[PDB]
């Protein structure tokens, strides 16, 4: 019966696994750890490299930033709804059908 | 990372605005609670005597057995939803054990 | 010969999902709430009609 | 942080904080040999280049600033690593190879390449990692009668897999006619000599090549360079250089029941949770450093010029990387702000039940619930 | 001297049944549900019962071998292209007492990995794979009851040497009442489920049944 | 392509949020639907006599 | 939607547990156990 | 990659090629025989479980 | 008057055309097609584009 705020938990907590998840990826890059490329190559390789995994996270973070926003749209709707049904169900009688 | 950080500053403004989206969210969530349940001026109290012409509300209305004075349902309704701690009390003094 | 726009989307690796509900279904709810509206008021969506 | 100088009244995140390292250690394993990549870069004849020779390299101080003094080549050419860098870093497994080869087809001993040589005579793998070293050899390997010492394959039925070696001598079947082992129609000797000259252009000279390949994997390493050791600290805030792993954090002793053959201790978080010593054998544990936010709390620069800062996450028995009123919150630790046993509306919100106002009684600022 | 002593073998189909998963690599996991990629038998296949009481068996990828004989017979194995002189000519012949590794070809005292220790009612199960020059042989002791045919469980098979040798191998052929199984190994994706340790004890492989595809 | 696979398997797992974001669209129309239309219990009819 | 495999299509009417297509459910019923398609 | 079809598209005499939208090559000429021939890709789909 | 459901079909047929004629662009590569890329280069360059 409860699955809405299973799912509001579920939602946050699959986004910020794949938020987590996404550090291990290469980007085309030789390598997923910023370490190895700074030990392993000179200069302006490894100023390649890192400019590739920056280009990569920012990404996976600009689209976390806009998923959030969505999920915030919907939650401030859902909310809105709420404060209504408060207002009206508890602190009155409602004459609207189904209501 | 010290070649990161200042490859990164060439990249403009976007984790301030990143920063300013995920603030806006975080004081909106804060704006929906205090919006659906702060309805009320004054704490009511129920009286001693329960009696209402009959109907019980014994499991809606709270007991203080709990430290937490919720009611019944209310304690179904948080024993039902695997809701995680979510990193709240002090996160990095959890982290810290031999696990 | 003349290729369709919708055989290109379909070829591209764009699907379309047909909905859940056809249409004769939509027609049908459609009237039953008529009918029920028609012979009983307002009872219908309160109870029993 | 926020680009004006009248600030209003509120909570504002500005940084973050965190604990610097204070030490750096190095744990390099106990070797001495050196060993001769000298017989590799000098020698009187180097093999070809379907015969090419493979020696093992392990258990090596190798030291790779001198191999510029030892043959008269243009360029390092190392793909996966830099040159200069080999000193620092430390890898399993070392390969030498040496064969010679022509002008014309230097450029095709890289990875991912087509040619005669690339398909019939010697391939590289596609993530080859390491070095390749190669210089003309004009003054050594032409006669004015003709070099003929070195051969090279032509006819085959198929590519070459990376890193083989085929010596096979068979009569090419390049038609119907069996060869038997006789030369004739459609029967041509794979093995074609080279036919070189002084006397040619600059793209028909021998060439040496010697070929450095790096196997990085998870072995525990046994070539690593003249980098001095460190004694081992724990339970500190310190640089680490574990084999390869450079990184900061906080060293404790763990409970992860290794495996004989393991080494490293990734779970779920990654990034190398657990390690192994090589120079003693006892497990260890990787947890980085304090960190998290910090939040300044304020009323307006019209009012007053007092402020409370708060540190998220952190319960203030590790704080430091008015001044003397420290409050246990649930959101953080509170610095600056004193409690009260009191309860008034909520002027700046700060955690879970806690908010803060700017008290007329002497000034200051007050938290409460 | 040469002889020929009981080379008759006869073979039986059998199934797999889930057996013969190791670990893909040198990092310890805890309590994850991990997918690698690599050379495993695939679940439920067909591998087989050679009795003997012997020319050469296909090497292909990997050799998925077992043997339940308690009179320990099974004592060598032997690798190669061709088993003989000139070339392509290899030996990986081991052996019991001190177990040698003697890669010595017949042609001509060539290198050698003489390494001593020792290899060694119980099903002894081995996989032989040879990837990238290296020589990776795994093994693991398993009791086994309830009478003949491989149990159902999970049995991980710890790596036990490892070898580099960098060669061509094709054929293979076991060294000498006689029951051993045979099985092949092909590039599969598996899921395997840690524990609280690090002992694999269960699996699932991705391209059995759609279910397992869902699983995935 | 297999090489532009091979290649596209670096870049993380983007296709499965997308995969995932187009299945709770689809999901999501069909909750529309239903939650429109759907609102009687009974298929109700009319009487012959109009 | 398709066409599936697997499961029987029956000449009956139940509630949808498992939405396919076009007015197509199915479901695991008890009455020899097995996956039936219904509309 | 695809099926090779016989056309019955009127492609002029100096015209080789076919497109469509997003550079769909939809018909070919042969360079041995003066014939058309249409390109359409195999089959495909989703599998659910 | 049905101007609103109108939109909803053209919304969504322009979008997935536009999505279709989004593969026909080189993105600064040398060409828009997979395969001549493939066949026109070696490995590290056609990797490139
Ligand atoms: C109101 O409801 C509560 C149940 O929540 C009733 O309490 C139960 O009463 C029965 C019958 O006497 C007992 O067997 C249970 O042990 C009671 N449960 C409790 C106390 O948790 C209560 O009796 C109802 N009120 C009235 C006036 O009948
Ligand atoms: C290296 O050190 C370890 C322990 O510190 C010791 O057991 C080993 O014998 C040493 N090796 C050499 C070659 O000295
Ligand atoms: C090359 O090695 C030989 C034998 O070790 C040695 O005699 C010779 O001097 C070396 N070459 C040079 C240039 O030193
Ligand atoms: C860290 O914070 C927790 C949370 O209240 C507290 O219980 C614990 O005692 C603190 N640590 C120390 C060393 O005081
Ligand atoms: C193995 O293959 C043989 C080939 O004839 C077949 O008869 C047997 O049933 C197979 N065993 C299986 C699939 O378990
Ligand atoms: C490996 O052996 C096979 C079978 O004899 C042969 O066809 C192939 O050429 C060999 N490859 C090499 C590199 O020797
Ligand atoms: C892990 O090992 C401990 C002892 O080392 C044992 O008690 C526990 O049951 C094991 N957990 C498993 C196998 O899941
Ligand atoms: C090439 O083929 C075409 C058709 O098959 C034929 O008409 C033509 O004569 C051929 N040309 C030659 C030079 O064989």
Same mark, same amino acid.
């Not at chain 1, 990404?59 to 207002?87: D, G, P």
């Not at chain 2, 209402?52 to 499991?59: A, D, K, V």
């Not at chain 3, 690796?13 to 307002?42: F, N």
């Not at chain 5, 073998?9 to 994850?32: A, E, I, L, W």
């Given at each position: 019966?409860?699955?809405?705020?299973?799912?509001?938990?579920?939602?946050?907590?699959?986004?910020?696994?794949?938020?987590?998840?996404?550090?291990?990826?290469? @980007?085309?890059?030789?390598?997923?750890?910023?370490?190895?490329?700074?030990?392993?190559?000179?200069?302006?390789?490894?100023?390649?490299?890192?400019?590739?995994?920056?280009?990569?996270?920012?990404?996976?973070?600009?689209?976390?930033?806009?998923?959030?926003?969505?999920?915030?749209?919907?939650?401030?709707?859902?909310?809105?709804?709420?404060?209504?049904?408060?207002?009206?169900?508890?602190?009155?009688?409602?004459?609207?059908?189904? @209501? | 990372?010290?070649?990161?950080?200042?490859?990164?500053?060439?990249?403009?403004?976007?984790?301030?605005?990143?920063?300013?989206?995920?603030?806006?969210?975080?004081?909106?969530?804060?704006?929906?609670?205090?919006?659906?349940?702060?309805?009320?001026?004054?704490?009511?109290?129920?009286?001693?005597?329960?009696?209402?012409?009959?109907?019980?509300?014994?499991?809606?209305?709270?007991?203080?057995?709990?430290?937490?004075?919720?009611?019944?349902?209310?304690?179904?309704?948080?024993?039902?939803?695997?809701?995680?701690?979510?990193?709240?009390?002090?996160?990095?003094?959890?982290?810290?054990?031999?696990? | 010969?003349?290729?369709?726009?919708?055989?290109?989307?379909?070829?591209?690796?764009?699907?379309?999902?047909?909905?859940?509900?056809?249409?004769?279904?939509?027609?049908?709810?459609?009237?039953?709430?008529?009918?029920?509206?028609?012979?009983?008021?307002?009872?219908?969506?309160?109870?029993?009609? | 942080?926020?680009?004006?100088?009248?600030?209003?009244?509120?909570?504002?995140?500005?940084?973050? *904080?965190? /604990?610097?390292?204070?030490?750096?250690?190095?744990?390099?394993?106990?070797?001495?040999?050196?060993?001769?990549?000298?017989?590799?870069?000098?020698?009187?004849?180097?093999?070809?280049?379907?015969?090419?020779?493979?020696?093992?390299?392990?258990?090596? /101080?190798?030291?790779?600033?001198?191999? &510029?003094?030892?043959?008269?080549?243009?360029? *390092?050419?190392? &793909?996966?690593?830099?040159?200069?860098?080999?000193?620092?870093?430390?890898?399993?497994?070392?390969?030498?190879?040496?064969?010679?080869?022509?002008?014309?087809?230097?450029?095709?001993?890289?990875?991912?390449?087509?040619?005669?040589?690339?398909?019939?005579?010697?391939?590289?793998?596609?993530?080859?990692?390491?070095?390749?070293?190669?210089?003309?050899?004009?003054?050594?390997?032409?006669?004015?009668?003709?070099?003929?010492?070195?051969?090279?394959?032509? *006819?085959?039925?198929?590519?070459?897999?990376?890193?083989?070696?085929?010596?096979?001598?068979?009569? &090419?079947?390049?038609?119907?006619?069996?060869?038997?082992?006789?030369?004739?129609?459609?029967?041509?000797?794979?093995?074609?000599?080279?036919?070189?000259?002084?006397?040619?252009?600059?793209?028909?000279?021998?060439?040496?090549?010697? /070929?450095?390949?790096?196997?990085?994997?998870?072995?525990?390493?046994?070539?690593?360079?003249?980098?001095?050791?460190?004694?081992?600290?724990?339970?500190?805030?310190?640089?680490?250089? *574990?084999?390869?792993?450079?990184?900061?954090?906080?060293?404790?002793?763990?409970?992860?029941?290794?495996?004989?053959?393991?080494?490293?201790?990734?779970?779920?978080?990654?990034?190398?949770?657990?390690?192994?010593?090589?120079?003693?054998?006892?497990?260890?544990?990787?947890?980085?450093?304090?960190?998290?936010?910090?939040?300044?709390?304020?009323?307006?620069?019209?009012?007053?010029?007092?402020?409370?800062?708060?540190?998220?996450?952190?319960?203030?028995?590790?704080?430091?990387?008015?001044?003397?009123? /420290?409050?246990?919150?649930?959101?953080?630790?509170?610095?600056?702000?004193?409690?009260?046993?009191?309860?008034?509306?909520?002027?700046?919100?700060?955690?879970?039940?806690?908010?803060?106002?700017?008290?007329?009684?002497?000034?200051?600022?007050?938290?409460?619930? | 001297?040469?002889?020929?002593?009981?080379?008759?073998?006869?073979?039986?189909?059998?199934?797999?049944?889930?057996?013969?998963?190791?670990?893909?690599?040198?990092?310890?996991?805890?309590?994850?549900?991990?997918?690698?990629?690599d050379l495993f038998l695939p679940?439920?296949s067909?591998?087989?019962?050679?009795?003997?009481?012997?020319?050469?068996?296909?090497?292909n990828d990997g050799?998925?071998?077992?043997?339940?004989?308690?009179?320990?017979?099974?004592?060598?194995?032997?690798?190669?292209?061709?088993?003989?002189?000139?070339?392509?000519?290899?030996?990986?012949?081991?052996?019991?007492?001190?177990?040698?590794?003697? %890669?010595?070809?017949?042609?001509?005292?060539?290198?050698?990995?003489?390494?001593?220790?020792?290899?060694?009612?119980?099903?002894?199960?081995?996989?032989?794979?040879?990837?990238?020059?290296?020589?990776?042989?795994?093994?693991?002791?398993?009791?086994?009851?309830?009478?003949?045919?491989?149990?159902?469980?999970?049995?991980?098979?710890?790596?036990? %040497?490892?070898?580099?040798?960098?060669?061509?191998?094709?054929?293979?052929?076991?060294?000498? $009442? $006689?029951?051993?199984?045979?099985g092949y190994l092909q590039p599969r994706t598996?899921?395997?489920?840690?524990?609280?340790?690090?002992?694999?004890?269960?699996?699932?492989?991705?391209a059995?049944?759609?279910?397992?595809?869902?699983?995935?």
């Open positions: 019966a409860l699955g809405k705020l299973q799912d509001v938990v579920n939602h946050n907590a699959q986004a910020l696994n794949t938020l987590v998840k996404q550090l291990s990826s290469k @980007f085309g890059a030789i390598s997923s750890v910023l370490n190895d490329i700074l030990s392993r190559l000179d200069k302006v390789e490894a100023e390649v490299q890192i400019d590739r995994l920056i280009t990569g996270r920012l990404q996976s973070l600009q689209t976390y930033v806009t998923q959030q926003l969505i999920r915030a749209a919907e939650i401030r709707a859902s909310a809105n709804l709420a404060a209504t049904k408060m207002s009206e169900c508890v602190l009155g009688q409602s004459k609207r059908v189904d @209501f | 990372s010290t070649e990161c950080s200042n490859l990164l500053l060439q990249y403009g403004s976007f984790c301030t605005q990143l920063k300013r989206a995920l603030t806006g969210i975080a004081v909106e969530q804060d704006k929906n609670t205090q919006e659906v349940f702060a309805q009320v001026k004054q704490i009511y109290k129920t009286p001693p005597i329960k009696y209402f012409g009959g109907f019980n509300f014994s499991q809606i209305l709270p007991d203080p057995s709990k430290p937490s004075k919720r009611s019944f349902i209310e304690d179904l309704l948080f024993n039902k939803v695997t809701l995680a701690d979510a990193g709240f009390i002090k996160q990095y003094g959890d982290c810290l054990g031999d696990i | 010969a003349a290729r369709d726009l919708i055989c290109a989307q379909k070829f591209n690796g764009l699907t379309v999902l047909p909905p859940l509900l056809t249409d004769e279904m939509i027609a049908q709810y459609t009237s039953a709430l008529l009918a029920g509206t028609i012979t009983s008021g307002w009872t219908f969506g309160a109870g029993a009609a | 942080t926020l680009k004006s100088f009248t600030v209003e009244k509120g909570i504002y995140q500005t940084s973050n *904080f965190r /604990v610097q390292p204070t030490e750096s250690i190095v744990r390099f394993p106990n070797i001495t040999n050196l060993c001769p990549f000298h017989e590799v870069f000098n020698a009187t004849t180097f093999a070809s280049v379907y015969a090419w020779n493979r020696k093992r390299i392990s258990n090596c /101080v190798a030291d790779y600033s001198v191999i &510029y003094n030892f043959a008269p080549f243009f360029a *390092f050419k190392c &793909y996966g690593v830099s040159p200069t860098k080999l000193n620092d870093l430390c890898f399993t497994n070392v390969y030498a190879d040496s064969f010679v080869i022509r002008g014309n087809e230097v450029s095709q001993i890289a990875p991912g390449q087509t040619g005669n040589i690339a398909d019939y005579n010697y391939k590289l793998p596609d993530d080859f990692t390491g070095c390749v070293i190669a210089w003309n050899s004009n003054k050594l390997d032409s006669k004015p009668s003709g070099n003929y010492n070195y051969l090279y394959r032509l *006819f085959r039925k198929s590519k070459l897999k990376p890193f083989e070696r085929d010596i096979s001598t068979e009569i &090419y079947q390049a038609g119907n006619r069996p060869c038997n082992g006789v030369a004739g129609p459609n029967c041509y000797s794979p093995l074609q000599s080279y036919g070189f000259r002084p006397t040619y252009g600059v793209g028909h000279q021998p060439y040496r090549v010697v /070929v450095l390949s790096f196997e990085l994997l998870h072995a525990p390493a046994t070539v690593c360079g003249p980098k001095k050791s460190t004694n081992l600290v724990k339970n500190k805030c310190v640089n680490f250089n *574990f084999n390869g792993l450079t990184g900061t954090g906080v060293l404790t002793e763990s409970n992860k029941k290794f495996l004989p053959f393991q080494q490293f201790g990734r779970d779920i978080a990654d990034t190398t949770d657990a390690v192994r010593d090589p120079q003693t054998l006892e497990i260890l544990d990787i947890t980085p450093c304090s960190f998290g936010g910090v939040s300044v709390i304020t009323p307006g620069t019209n009012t007053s010029n007092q402020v409370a800062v708060l540190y998220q996450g952190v319960n203030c028995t590790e704080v430091p990387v008015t001044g003397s009123n /420290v409050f246990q919150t649930r959101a953080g630790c509170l610095i600056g702000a004193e409690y009260v046993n009191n309860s008034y509306e909520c002027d700046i919100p700060i955690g879970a039940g806690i908010c803060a106002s700017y008290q007329t009684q002497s000034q200051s600022i007050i938290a409460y619930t | 001297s040469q002889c020929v002593n009981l080379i008759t073998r006869t073979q039986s189909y059998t199934n797999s049944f889930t057996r013969g998963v190791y670990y893909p690599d040198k990092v310890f996991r805890s309590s994850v549900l991990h997918s690698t990629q679940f439920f067909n591998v087989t019962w050679f009795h003997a009481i012997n020319p050469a068996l296909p090497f050799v998925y071998f077992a043997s339940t004989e308690k009179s320990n017979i099974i004592r060598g194995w032997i690798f190669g292209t061709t088993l003989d002189s000139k070339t392509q000519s290899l030996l990986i012949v081991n052996n019991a007492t001190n177990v040698v590794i003697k %890669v010595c070809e017949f042609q001509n005292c060539t290198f050698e990995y003489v390494s001593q220790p020792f290899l060694m009612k119980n099903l002894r199960e081995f996989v032989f794979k040879n990837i990238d020059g290296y020589f990776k042989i795994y093994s693991k002791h398993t009791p086994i009851n309830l009478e003949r045919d491989l149990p159902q469980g999970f049995s991980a098979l710890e790596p036990l %040497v490892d070898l580099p040798i960098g060669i061509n191998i094709t054929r293979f052929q076991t060294l000498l $009442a $006689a029951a051993y199984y045979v598996f899921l395997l489920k840690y524990n609280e340790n690090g002992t694999i004890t269960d699996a699932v492989d991705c059995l049944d759609p279910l397992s595809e869902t699983k995935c």
